[PDB]
Copies of this chain bind each other. A is one copy, B any other.
Amino acid sequence: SLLTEVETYVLSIIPSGPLKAEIAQRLEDVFAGKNTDLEVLMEWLKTRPILSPLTKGILGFVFTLTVPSERGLQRRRFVQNALNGNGDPNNMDKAVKLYRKLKREITFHGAKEISLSYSAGALASCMGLIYNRMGAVTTEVAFGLVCATCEQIADSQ
């Protein structure tokens, strides 16, 4: 399935161990529609020791996209800080060019494919644009972007 494919890309980013196990399970529960209190989920994520801030941002982004019940939770500073991109305009320029292209995609594969022509840095900031409501895209395309950025990160490790 798609959600399973997303989970595999998402997990490739997490170092092996007990925490990776928990996240997988939370991912599966949210994907199966069992888990749903976003605020509780995001706070758990925020407080995880050892997890890279950037992996915290990616999972935070994934949870808010998949959870049905976002309710009225304001976007999280921890995720924003993790995905924003440091303030480099050159990197932001690339994130915007990617967004321009993703705006035309409607499939997971097409979305994932153009995202592969961008660096892990432009990709994370593009995720930030979307998480910040600066740009908007369909959940399937958002999924493709997420997977390309996870692959890039994991591939670099």
Could you say how many copies of this chain the assembly holds?
2
- A124-149 CB contact bits vs B (8 Å, 1 = yes)? 01001100111110000000000000
Number of interface residues of A (CB under 8 A): 26
Query: Taking A87-B134, A129-B134 as contacts, is the C-beta distance between A92 and B96 under 8 angstroms?
Result: yes
A93 at the interface (CB under 8 A from B): yes
Instruction: Tell me which of B85, B128, B133 contacts A81 (CB under 8 A).
Output: B133
Cα–Cα distance between A76 and B77 once the two chains are bound (Å): 11
- A105-139 CB contact bits vs B (8 Å, 1 = yes)? 00000000000000000000100110011111000
Cα–Cα distance between A25 and B81 once the two chains are bound (Å): 33
Cα–Cα distance between A132 and B133 once the two chains are bound (Å): 9
- A80-116 CB contact bits vs B (8 Å, 1 = yes)? 1100110101001100110110010000000000000
Query: Taking A74-B77, A99-B92 as contacts, is the C-beta distance between A87 and B136 under 8 angstroms?
Result: yes
A132 and B135 form a contact (CB under 8 A): no
Instruction: Tell me which of B75, B87, B133 contacts A135 (CB under 8 A).
Output: B87
- List residues of chain B with CB within 8 A of the CB of A133: 77, 80-81, 84, 87
Cα–Cα distance between A76 and B136 once the two chains are bound (Å): 17
Instruction: Tell me which of B81, B84, B96 contacts A96 (CB under 8 A).
Output: B96
Which residue of chain B lies nearest to A74 when distances are taken between CB atoms in the complex? B74
* Contacts of A22-63 to chain B: CB distance below 8 A: none
A residues near B, CB below 8 A?
72, 74-77, 80-81, 84-85, 87, 89, 92-93, 96-97, 99-100, 103, 125, 128-129, 132-136
